[PDB]
Scaffold this active site. Sequence first.
Site, mmCIF file in Angstrom:
data_model
loop_
_atom_site.group_PDB
_atom_site.id
_atom_site.type_symbol
_atom_site.label_atom_id
_atom_site.label_comp_id
_atom_site.label_asym_id
_atom_site.label_seq_id
_atom_site.Cartn_x
_atom_site.Cartn_y
_atom_site.Cartn_z
ATOM 1 N N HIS A 165 10.797 -17.965 31.927
ATOM 2 C CA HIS A 165 11.139 -19.678 32.145
ATOM 3 C C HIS A 165 12.123 -20.186 31.368
ATOM 4 O O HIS A 165 13.130 -20.797 31.688
ATOM 5 C CB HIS A 165 9.943 -20.485 32.207
ATOM 6 N N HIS B 170 17.145 -21.112 30.117
ATOM 7 C CA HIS B 170 16.364 -21.237 31.127
ATOM 8 C C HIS B 170 16.773 -20.123 32.425
ATOM 9 O O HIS B 170 17.339 -20.648 33.116
ATOM 10 C CB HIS B 170 15.849 -22.351 31.501
ATOM 11 N N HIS C 203 -1.136 -58.010 27.862
ATOM 12 C CA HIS C 203 -0.157 -58.392 28.588
ATOM 13 C C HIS C 203 1.201 -59.113 27.304
ATOM 14 O O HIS C 203 2.157 -59.413 27.836
ATOM 15 C CB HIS C 203 -0.618 -59.553 29.398
ATOM 16 N N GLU D 49 6.677 -49.660 38.110
ATOM 17 C CA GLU D 49 7.739 -49.816 37.046
ATOM 18 C C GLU D 49 8.398 -48.675 36.793
ATOM 19 O O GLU D 49 9.683 -48.767 37.018
ATOM 20 C CB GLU D 49 7.237 -50.288 35.832
HETATM 21 C C1 LIG Z 1 1.019 -51.877 35.250
HETATM 22 C C2 LIG Z 1 0.821 -53.110 35.723
HETATM 23 N N1 LIG Z 1 1.900 -53.753 36.342
HETATM 24 C C3 LIG Z 1 1.805 -55.151 36.864
HETATM 25 C C4 LIG Z 1 0.605 -55.919 36.416
HETATM 26 C C5 LIG Z 1 0.626 -57.429 37.008
HETATM 27 N N2 LIG Z 1 -0.341 -57.434 38.128
HETATM 28 C C6 LIG Z 1 -1.509 -57.855 37.853
HETATM 29 S S1 LIG Z 1 -2.419 -57.566 39.228
HETATM 30 C C7 LIG Z 1 -1.139 -56.954 40.248
HETATM 31 C C8 LIG Z 1 -1.191 -56.651 41.396
HETATM 32 C C9 LIG Z 1 -2.246 -57.205 42.193
HETATM 33 O O1 LIG Z 1 -2.482 -56.480 43.515
HETATM 34 P P1 LIG Z 1 -3.745 -55.767 43.502
HETATM 35 O O2 LIG Z 1 -3.836 -54.664 42.233
HETATM 36 O O3 LIG Z 1 -4.106 -55.014 45.009
HETATM 37 O O4 LIG Z 1 -4.944 -56.869 43.353
HETATM 38 P P2 LIG Z 1 -5.897 -57.776 44.360
HETATM 39 O O5 LIG Z 1 -4.760 -58.498 45.343
HETATM 40 O O6 LIG Z 1 -6.671 -56.912 44.872
HETATM 41 O O7 LIG Z 1 -6.389 -58.823 43.174
HETATM 42 C C10 LIG Z 1 -0.045 -57.011 39.461
HETATM 43 C C11 LIG Z 1 1.315 -56.850 39.877
HETATM 44 C C12 LIG Z 1 -0.163 -55.233 35.631
HETATM 45 N N3 LIG Z 1 -1.528 -55.919 35.485
HETATM 46 N N4 LIG Z 1 -0.235 -53.858 35.388
HETATM 47 C C1 LIG Z 2 8.805 -35.188 31.680
HETATM 48 C C2 LIG Z 2 8.911 -33.860 30.802
HETATM 49 N N1 LIG Z 2 7.511 -33.382 30.297
HETATM 50 C C3 LIG Z 2 7.619 -32.062 29.834
HETATM 51 C C4 LIG Z 2 8.877 -31.437 29.843
HETATM 52 C C5 LIG Z 2 9.044 -30.134 29.093
HETATM 53 N N2 LIG Z 2 9.170 -29.101 29.902
HETATM 54 C C6 LIG Z 2 10.245 -28.584 30.038
HETATM 55 S S1 LIG Z 2 10.142 -27.326 31.700
HETATM 56 C C7 LIG Z 2 8.692 -27.850 31.712
HETATM 57 C C8 LIG Z 2 7.764 -27.193 32.925
HETATM 58 C C9 LIG Z 2 8.729 -26.397 33.819
HETATM 59 O O1 LIG Z 2 7.871 -25.756 34.682
HETATM 60 P P1 LIG Z 2 8.338 -25.752 36.059
HETATM 61 O O2 LIG Z 2 8.794 -27.232 36.476
HETATM 62 O O3 LIG Z 2 7.101 -25.240 37.150
HETATM 63 O O4 LIG Z 2 9.659 -24.918 36.018
HETATM 64 P P2 LIG Z 2 10.087 -23.471 36.840
HETATM 65 O O5 LIG Z 2 8.637 -22.542 36.647
HETATM 66 O O6 LIG Z 2 10.593 -23.656 38.227
HETATM 67 O O7 LIG Z 2 11.152 -22.732 35.686
HETATM 68 C C10 LIG Z 2 8.205 -28.771 30.684
HETATM 69 C C11 LIG Z 2 6.647 -29.184 30.404
HETATM 70 C C12 LIG Z 2 9.885 -31.911 30.252
HETATM 71 N N3 LIG Z 2 11.221 -31.136 30.545
HETATM 72 N N4 LIG Z 2 10.053 -33.165 31.059
HETATM 73 O O1 LIG Z 3 -1.412 -60.940 36.298
HETATM 74 C C1 LIG Z 3 -0.970 -61.139 37.386
HETATM 75 C C2 LIG Z 3 -0.737 -62.466 37.732
HETATM 76 O O2 LIG Z 3 -0.109 -62.621 39.040
HETATM 77 C C3 LIG Z 3 0.403 -63.049 36.876
HETATM 78 O O3 LIG Z 3 -0.268 -62.700 35.823
HETATM 79 C C4 LIG Z 3 0.835 -64.436 37.308
HETATM 80 O O4 LIG Z 3 1.380 -65.304 36.300
HETATM 81 P P1 LIG Z 3 2.260 -66.529 36.339
HETATM 82 O O5 LIG Z 3 1.814 -67.771 36.314
HETATM 83 O O6 LIG Z 3 2.643 -66.359 34.587
HETATM 84 O O7 LIG Z 3 3.526 -66.120 37.226
HETATM 85 O O1 LIG Z 4 11.669 -25.366 29.038
HETATM 86 C C1 LIG Z 4 10.894 -26.142 28.233
HETATM 87 C C2 LIG Z 4 11.801 -26.035 26.619
HETATM 88 O O2 LIG Z 4 13.181 -25.478 26.744
HETATM 89 C C3 LIG Z 4 10.828 -24.927 26.080
HETATM 90 O O3 LIG Z 4 9.568 -25.450 26.049
HETATM 91 C C4 LIG Z 4 11.303 -25.095 24.569
HETATM 92 O O4 LIG Z 4 10.736 -23.917 23.657
HETATM 93 P P1 LIG Z 4 10.685 -23.846 22.030
HETATM 94 O O5 LIG Z 4 9.319 -23.896 21.879
HETATM 95 O O6 LIG Z 4 11.495 -22.529 21.829
HETATM 96 O O7 LIG Z 4 11.311 -25.171 21.726
#
Ligand SMILES: Cc1ncc(C[n+]2csc(CCOP(=O)(O)OP(=O)(O)O)c2C)c(N)n1
Ligand SMILES: Cc1ncc(C[n+]2csc(CCOP(=O)(O)OP(=O)(O)O)c2C)c(N)n1
Ligand SMILES: O=C[C@H](O)[C@H](O)COP(=O)(O)O
Ligand SMILES: O=C[C@H](O)[C@H](O)COP(=O)(O)O
Lengths: 650, 650
Positions: free
Chosen positions: A262, A29, A467, A405
Amino acid sequence: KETRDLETLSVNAIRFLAIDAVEKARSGHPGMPMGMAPLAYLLFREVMRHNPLDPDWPDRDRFVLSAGHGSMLLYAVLHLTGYDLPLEELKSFRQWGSKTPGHPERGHTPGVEVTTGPLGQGISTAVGLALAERKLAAEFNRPGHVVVDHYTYVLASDGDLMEGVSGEAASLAGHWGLSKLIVFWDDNRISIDGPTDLAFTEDVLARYRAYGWQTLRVEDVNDLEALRKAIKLAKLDERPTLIAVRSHIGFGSPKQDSAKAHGEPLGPEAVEATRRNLGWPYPPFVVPEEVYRHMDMREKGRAWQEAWEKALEAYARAYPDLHQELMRRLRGELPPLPEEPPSFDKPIATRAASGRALNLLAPRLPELLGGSADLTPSNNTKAEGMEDFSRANPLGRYLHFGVREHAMGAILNGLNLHGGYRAYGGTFLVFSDYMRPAIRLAALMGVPTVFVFTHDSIALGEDGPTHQPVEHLMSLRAMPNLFVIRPADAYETFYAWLVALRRKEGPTALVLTRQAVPLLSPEKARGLLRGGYVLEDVEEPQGVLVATGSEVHLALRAQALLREKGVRVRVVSLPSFELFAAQPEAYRKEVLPPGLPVVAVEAGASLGWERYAHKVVALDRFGASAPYPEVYERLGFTPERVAEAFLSLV
Amino acid sequence: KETRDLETLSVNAIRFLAIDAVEKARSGHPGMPMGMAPLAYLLFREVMRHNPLDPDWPDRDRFVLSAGHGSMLLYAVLHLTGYDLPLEELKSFRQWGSKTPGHPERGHTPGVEVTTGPLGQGISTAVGLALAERKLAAEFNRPGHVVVDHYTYVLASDGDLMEGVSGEAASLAGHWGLSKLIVFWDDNRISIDGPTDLAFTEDVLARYRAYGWQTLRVEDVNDLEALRKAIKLAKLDERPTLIAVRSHIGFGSPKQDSAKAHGEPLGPEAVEATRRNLGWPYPPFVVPEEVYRHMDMREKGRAWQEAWEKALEAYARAYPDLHQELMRRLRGELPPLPEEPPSFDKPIATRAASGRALNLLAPRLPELLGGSADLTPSNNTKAEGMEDFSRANPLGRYLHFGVREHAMGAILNGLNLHGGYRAYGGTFLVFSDYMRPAIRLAALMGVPTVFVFTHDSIALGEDGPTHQPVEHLMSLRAMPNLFVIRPADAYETFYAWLVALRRKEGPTALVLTRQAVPLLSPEKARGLLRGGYVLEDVEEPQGVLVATGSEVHLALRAQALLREKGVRVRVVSLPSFELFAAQPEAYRKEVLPPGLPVVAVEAGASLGWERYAHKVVALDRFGASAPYPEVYERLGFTPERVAEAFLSLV
Ligand SMILES: Cc1ncc(C[n+]2csc(CCOP(=O)(O)OP(=O)(O)O)c2C)c(N)n1
Ligand SMILES: Cc1ncc(C[n+]2csc(CCOP(=O)(O)OP(=O)(O)O)c2C)c(N)n1
Ligand SMILES: O=C[C@H](O)[C@H](O)COP(=O)(O)O
Ligand SMILES: O=C[C@H](O)[C@H](O)COP(=O)(O)O
Ligand SMILES: [Ca+2]
Ligand SMILES: [Ca+2]
C-alpha cells in the site's frame, strides 16, 4: 496481439514508472498504481477528450484521483501522453520543489484537477465539477451550438467510500441526476490495517443504488473490453455511475493482495521479481519509443481543442451576447461591482444585511451560485432573483445542500474549480466544524470559495452551547490562506462581500450575527477594505478599544462611559486580521499606535488577541441556553466590563 | 377504551407540555415533539427499563435524543415519569440557569444521556453506548449471572440521516452486529428548508439494509400497537434495527406538515386551535393527576434496579474478583499505574514511545480500549497484548474504525460515556478536522476521551501539505475543556499518557511525531506534569527559548549555538498550554521571568504565541512534499534561524 502487446506494453510502462519513482523516492504508494494502471491507460489514451498542450481547455473531460496516495499512477500517465511533466520530475517524486509531490496538488502540476490525499475530498469535490458542467450546459448550449459537453471521471479507494463526506455527496449527486459523473472504485479488498473485512463489509453498490446511482462491476481491471463497455453503459444512463473494479493491490509482485503493497517501496528484490513476472526488460525510468508514440495525445488534443474553439466561433456569430458572457466567466473576470452599499434605515442582523448585499450583487453576477445546508431561512443566502436548482430546473442558481455541511464544502470547491461559476454556501459558524477539511482544501488549492457563517456568537441566544461558537474565529484565523471577515454592521457587510468576491487567491469566511446590531456610517465602514481602521477617533488618544463584529458596538458604548470619566480611547474595527496584516506597516501603526494601551473585545476565545491587545474581554468557556441580550451580559459582554478592563491599564 | 383514553391523555400531556414550554419561552421546536409524543410515551411508560430515582443505574436502557431540537419531548416525559425535573423547569425552558436548556445537555438534566443538538452526534454516539454494553456483557456476564443487559434506543430526524457521521457509524454498527441498538427515524418528509425532496430523496432503508441493519416501517406513530410490534421485531433480530416511523410534524395544529412547525412557537391562534382539534381542555402546564399516576415510574424503577442490585450480590458471592473489577470500572476508579517510564536507548518518534507507554500501561488497565481510523501501523495504538474486537471476538480491546475519524470520535465518546471503559482512538493530527464536532462534543460533556494524533508537523516529510498540520494545535488549544499535550520526547510522552488517563473533567489530545527525535533526561521530562518547565537553565539568563514537542530539541541546538557566541538563554518545554496556565502565577513567572525576552519555536501557526513570546519561529503557510530533515530545514526550523530570531531582540 500487436494492439494487445502495445496496450500491455503501455499499461506496464505506467506500472514501472510508478514502481521505480517510489523506489528512487524510497517513499510513496506503489500498490494501487500497479493494480489501476489499466484504467489510467484507458482513460488518458481512449476515453477522455483532453489536451496535454492546454490542461485548462474548458471543455476537457476532468479526471479526479480521489485516491491521492496513488499519485504516481497520475504522474506516469500525464508524462506518457505528452503533458509538460518531464522524466526528471518523475525521478524527483516526493522531493522538494518537484512537480510530483506525494499527493496531487492542483496548481503545482499540469493536468492535476483537484488537490487530493484527504480521502472523500476528490470524489466529493467531483460532484461540483459535474454540477458545474450540467448547469453551464443548461445556461449556454443552444440548438446546433453545444459549447459545454464533458464528463467528470473519478478513481476512488475503499477509504473514499468509508468517509461520510462521500456518502453525503453521493446522496446529492443522485438527487440531482448528474448523468455525466463516472466513479471507478478500486475494489481490491485491502486497506492500511490489512483486509477491508476488518472494518468494511457493507454492500457498497447497494448503498449507491439507494442514493439513486447506477452500479456496474468489472471483475478484472486488466480486461480493457469490460472497462470500455461499462463506461458506455454509464454514459447512456441518466444517473451518476459507480463502477466497482476488482484489482490486485501490488498486481504482478510478491506483495500482491497484501497491505504491505500500500504505502512503502517494493524493495530491490520485489522490483526485480515484478520485472520477471510482468516480462519488463527495461531499466528504471526507461520506456521504449513505441509506447511514447502510442500514448502521445498532443495531436488528438490539438484536434479536440481546435474543434471546440471553432464551435465557439460559430456560437459567437449565432449568439454574441451569450458568447461574450461565457468567455468572461470562463476567464474568471468579474463585471464591474457596485461601489454603493444598499440603503439601511434601522438596526439589522449582519445575516439580513448579507441577504441585502446579495439582492444587489446577484442580478449583476449570473455566475454567482448560492446555497445552505438546510438553513436557507436562518442564513439569508437565497438572493432576490435566484430559483432552486433541480433536475427539472437546471438553471436554478440556489442549492439546497440538506444537512450536509461537509459535502457542501466539497461541492462549492468543485463548482469554483470548474470555471464559469462563483459559489457560496451557508450554515451556522459552529458547523464550520462539520466541513473543516473542505475549507482547508480550498485554502490549499487557492480556490476562492465563499463560506457564509451566521449565528456567530452567544448573542444567538436560546439554542445554547452546542450552537454557540467560542474557538471558531481563532481556529479559522490560524488556517493559512483563509480571510476571516466579521463585519460590525450592515455597511461593513457590504464591503465584506466586495472583499470576498474580489479575493481570488483563496477562500473567504464571512461571519454574521443572528441578532440585530446598529448601523455605522457607510463612509466609516468602507475602512473594512483595510481590514482594520479607526472608527471613532479622539483628541490625543490615551488608548484603543479594538473590536470585531457585534463587539464594535459594545466598544463604542465603552468609549462613551470612559469619555464621561475624562478617559479618551479611540475605537478600532478589525473586521479581518488577514486583510489588516497585509497593509503597510505605516498604516497599521496609524491605526494601533505603539506605546498606547489596547483592550480587545470579541465574544470568542482569547487565544491570539495578544498579537494586538494587552487585555482581552473574550470568552474561554462554552455558552448557555438563554435569551439575548441576557446571555451576552451575564457572560461578561457589557460596556461597564470593557471600561473596567481599560481603566486597569491606567 | 379507558386504557386507550389514558394513552391518548398521557400522549397529549407530552404534546401540550412541549407546546406550552415553547410558547412561554417564545423560542424552540414544538413540531417534532407533537409528531413523536406517542413514541416518548411508549419508550418511558412500557418499553424501557429505567429508574427515575437513579438515572445513573448502570444497567438502565439508554435513550439518545439525536434530533436534540425536540428537547421539550424529552423534558416532558422525564417530568411525567417522576425524574427530578419539576414543572417549574418546564416553565423555564431555554432561560438562564434552567435544567431545560434549548438542546439536551448531559450532566445538566437528570435522565439526559448525551449532549445533542449537532445532528449526527446522538445516533453516532449510541454506537459507542451499544459497543460498550456488548463488550462489558461479554467480559463480565457468567452462566447464571446476567449483570449487563440493556438496549440503546435512539430518536433521529432526517438531518441525523443526511449527516455523513451517521452513515460512518451505521456502517460500523452493521459490521459489528450491535443487535441491541434500536433507532427510530421521524420520517415526517419536512426539513427546515421545506419539503425533504428539496435535497433528500434517497431510499434511506435500502442504504441501512446495505449496512446490514434490519429495517422496519410503522405507517403511523399514533399506532402504539404498530410501535410495540416493530420494537419486539428489533429485539428478536441479531442486526441493529432502523424503524422508519411516519409522523406529521405539528400533528394537530394548523401548522401540521409545514416547515413553519419546526423551529418557532405555534403562536396563540395555533396553540388555541390545537387544544380544539385534539380536545385538550387543561390550561398551560396543567396535567391531570390521572396522567401523573399512570406515567409515574418510580415504583417500577426501584423494583428493576433492586433486582439488578440483588443479581450483583449473587455475582459478588459466585465471582468475587470479577465483581470487584466491575465495581471499580463502573465508578471510573483507576487501578495503580507504573510511575517510571519505559526505558529508551536511542532517538525515537513520540508515536513509537506512545506505543511503548501503552505496552507498559494497558496490561494494568483492562478497561482500556484502543483503536485507529485505518492507521494502526502509523499511530502505535495497538498495545502488545490487545486483540481485534469483532462480532466473533467481542473481548477484543482494539477497534479498527476504518477511514471514519468522525464516527470514531462519536463512538469513543459513547464508549467513555457508558461506564466500564476508557477509550482512545488514533489518526493523523491533520485529520482531527474530520472529527471536530465530536472532539467539541467531548469537551462540552466533560467526557475524558483521549484522542491520539500522530504526524504532528511538516516533519512527517514526503506525504506533503495535505497531511502536514499547521493551524491544528492553536485550533484545538482555542477549544474550552480540551488538554492539548505535545510531549518533546519518549519520556515526556509517558508523563502525557499519565496526565491524560488521570484527567477526568474533559478530553485530551496527545500530539506525536512521525520522525524520531532525541531522548531528554528521564527526570527532566517529569516537568511535563506542570504543563511547562525549565528543561536547560543557564547562569544569569539574557532570555528564553520556549518550545513544544519536536521543537524543544531545535531550541537546545539553538541554546548551544547562542552559548558559542557568548549569549546565554534558558530552554523551556511547554508540552501543554492548559496545564501550564493551571499552575500558580509564581511558578509561571519562575519558568518565564518577566522582562526577559522570549523567542517561541513550534512547527505550526504563529497565532496565540504572543501570549508567551515577543518573537515566534513558526509556520504560517502550508507544507511541502519532501523528506525530513530537509523539508523541516528549508521551511525555516534550523538552529541558525532560531538564534537569528533571538539576536534580533537580545
Ligand atoms: C449538524 C447540524 N447542522 C444543522 C443544524 C441546524 N438544524 C437544526 S434541526 C435541522 C434540520 C431539521 O430537519 P429534521 O432534522 O428532519 O427535523 P424535524 O423537521 O423532524 O424537526 C437543522 C438544519 C443542526 N442542528 N445540526
Ligand atoms: C480522511 C483521511 N483519513 C485518513 C487518511 C490516511 N490514509 C492514507 S491512505 C489510507 C487508506 C487507504 O486505503 P484504500 O483507500 O483502500 O487504499 P488502496 O488499498 O487502494 O491503496 C488512510 C487511512 C487519509 N488519507 N485521509
Ligand atoms: O436549529 C434549527 C432552527 O431552525 C434554527 O435554529 C432557527 O433559528 P433562527 O430564528 O435563528 O433563524
Ligand atoms: O498511505 C498512508 C500514509 O502514507 C502512511 O500511513 C504513512 O506511513 P508512515 O507510518 O511511514 O508515516
Ligand atoms: Ca483498498
Ligand atoms: Ca424531518
